[PDB]
Amino acid sequence: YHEDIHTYLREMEVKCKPKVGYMKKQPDITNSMRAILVDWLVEVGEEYKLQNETLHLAVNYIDRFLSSMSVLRGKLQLVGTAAMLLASKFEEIYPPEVAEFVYITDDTYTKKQVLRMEHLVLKVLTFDLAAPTVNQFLTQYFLHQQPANCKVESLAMFLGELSLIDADPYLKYLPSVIAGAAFHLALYTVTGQSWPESLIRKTGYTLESLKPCLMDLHQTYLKAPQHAQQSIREKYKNSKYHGVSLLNPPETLNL
């Protein structure tokens, strides 16, 4: 059923795809604000020991909600908090309480405000909280790699999380494409291996089909230490992720 799951994920990621360039329609918030919000969400997930899939789901919910709705400066953190709460409820075994998120917002919003924003996001998303993420496709690709290098997986997760910060240009790439580009970049970085033939057959993505996302992700990886948001780099510095953020990105991609 694994191939059926991959096909269903590829079909579903289109239906859960956020509108491309919705920040242009937003009159009050900009992509820098979204990057700051995603950095704070990474920090929050680290604080409450949330899984990476929860963070990816929260980012997807925020992107879709802001595609469908207009949010001011003072409500962007409320939207992010509601998305984090919804993702934790959907994914975590024991999601944090609403009071935990109210506290983690430095009491910017009350519990009633957080619950109202959660209701608004659920109404906007129409309870479509099962959106495929880069994490799921990355795990599916990890199931098709041998030998199973843990450094490859950690670097792929690091790059996939890095893709969440910048809406430009990672909102025009499907999560499967981003996951494939991250897997290839990690494989070339730590082992020098390219996009596997097994994944070529499974996903249909040749090394040329990932080339734009590959260049964008290589640029992000090279410029990661200089990025204004550094929460992901600190998070992946630990021995849990083998310290992949300390690894030197390849200077060039032999494509």
Binding site: I29, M33, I36, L37, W40, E43, V44, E46, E47, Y48, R73, G74, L76, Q77, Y103, I104, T105, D106, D107, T108
Partner: peptide, 9 residues
């Protein structure tokens, strides 16, 4: 830490 009110403005 992770507890902060983001001043987006």
């Amino acid at each position: 830490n992770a507890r902060r009110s983001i001043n987006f403005g």
